[PDB]
Design a binder for this molecule. Structure first.
Ligand SMILES: Nc1nc2c(c(=O)[nH]1)[n+](Cc1ccccc1)cn2[C@@H]1O[C@H](COP(=O)(O)O)[C@@H](O)[C@H]1O
Lengths: 14, 181
């Protein structure tokens, strides 16, 4: 299962 | 890892709804774009209007590819939604925040084994009061629906005072809460 933290996804925004 | 995009568990499809009373509800639903990586999600989100900036009567819907954002879908017609009801002051403080948070819960697969019970989510921009909702596949799955609501409410950071309802689409298409959290 592929799961991402909120923190990882926000760090990707730019 | 230097060059490969970060894949999501699912391909997701973003839809836009604009009310045109001369058309069937369904024909007002238009596909924006699909994406299956973290990077591609941000490329899409970063170039589109914030919900608080849409005309009243518009929706955004993010659903798993193959599941239409309508209660007629095989995967929706037995289900229901966890519903967040906003007043007009929360459009300012909460709407855009709450919605981004909802997408991150979908794409990042935030509900353990019950993320498979998630179909998608919709934001309704309305003059009378905005709404955000997560749709799940089976209103009967007490543990699935119940787990999703608990984690969703935590994720939105809503206080014990706020109580949110889950309504089956069967009830809606005819609204009482099967569950609250
Ligand atoms: N056939 C069909 N019609 C839908 C649908 C839908 O999935 N299928 N929806 C979306 C919907 C799906 C689940 C729960 C509430 C609303 C709204 N509508 C129509 O929009 C009206 C306003 O719904 P709203 O989208 O503003 O919540 C509703 O009474 C229906 O006539």
């Amino acid at each position: 299962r592929i799961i991402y933290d909120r923190k990882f996804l926000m760090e990707c925004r730019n | 890892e230097h060059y490969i995009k970060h894949p999501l568990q699912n391909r997701w499809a973003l839809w836009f709804f604009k009310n045109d009373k001369s058309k069937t509800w369904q024909a007002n639903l238009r596909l924006i774009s699909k994406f299956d990586t973290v990077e591609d999600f941000w490329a899409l989100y970063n170039h589109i209007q914030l919900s608080s900036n849409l005309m009243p009567g518009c929706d955004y819907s993010l659903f798993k590819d193959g599941i239409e954002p309508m209660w007629e879908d095989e995967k929706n017609k037995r289900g229901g939604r966890w519903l967040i009801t906003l007043n007009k002051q929360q459009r300012r403080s909460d709407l855009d925040r709450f919605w981004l948070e909802t997408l991150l819960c979908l794409i990042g697969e935030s509900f353990d084994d019950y993320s498979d019970d998630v179909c998608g989510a919709v934001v309704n921009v309305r003059a009378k009061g905005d709404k955000i909702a997560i749709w799940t596949t089976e209103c009967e799955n007490r543990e699935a629906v119940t787990h999703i609501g608990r984690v969703y409410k935590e994720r939105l950071g809503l206080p014990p005072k706020i109580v949110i309802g889950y309504q089956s689409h069967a009830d809606t298409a005819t609204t009482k809460n099967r569950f609250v959290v």
